[PDB]
């Protein structure tokens, strides 16, 4: 797999496809 | 953190992986 | 106006707009 | 869960933000 | 809710989850 | 080659491709 | 209407035309 | 207008809504 | 953990995660 | 194909490494 | 049909919509 | 090629066709 430069929307999607179904944490800084 | 990461610099899917539940 | 189906990677877009910087968890088994 | 309350029946975006952090 | 820094596609995106069903008018600059 | 289905977010993000700048009108209820 | 046309139905690029501004 | 405020500033989604049908 | 489903837009946005740089071809008629 | 492995079935991201360049 | 500026996975779902079905080819410089 | 003339410049949906099957 390759690296990813990611932002925005397009992070989620990653963790989406990444993880599916056994869901994930969006954890940003604040 | 990682969102930053992705980001600002690049990351691995095998680093996104660590955030699955 | 009734409300919408939202699944998969559209439902994890929409928790990403509504919640942003706060950061969200995506649980489907839950 | 999400998926029942969004996926299988409707959700609105205020109960969306039931899943915030 | 949380602010939104939406440009391109995001945005349409962003106007098809708050508006649904209703619809919505794309309107950009000329 | 047919032509494919178009719903929802993905109909709205294929508007936003043809139209760009002149804008567009997603109206279901019609 | 447009979901008929392009979503029930199927429809093509230029169709999708109609509904510029 | 809304398009080039959400891009080049930031905007709410109570001012998106302004926008719907 | 099982798979999951992946369909026209959502399919080629994952093709593009995971081969990035590298390129991919998606050929349904395949 | 693709659509078959990864749409009608289900496929694993390292099976969509098959269709990288 | 307007012109495009398109980055990352906004490409490719604009091939996808350009192309169905026909299937098409993501090749980026390396 | 493509790729960096859409991000970097602008290009056609007729320019895009070329890539088709
Ligand atoms: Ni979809
Ligand atoms: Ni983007």
Redesign the interface.
């Known amino acids: 797999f390759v690296n990813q430069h990611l932002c925005g929307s397009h992070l989620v999607e990653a963790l989406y496809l990444v993880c599916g179904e056994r869901g994930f944490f969006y954890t940003p800084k604040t | 953190?990682?969102?930053?990461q992705?980001?600002t610099?690049?990351?691995?899917?095998?680093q996104?992986?660590n955030?699955?539940?």
């Open positions: 953190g990682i969102v930053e992705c980001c610099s690049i990351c691995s899917l095998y996104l992986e955030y699955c539940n």
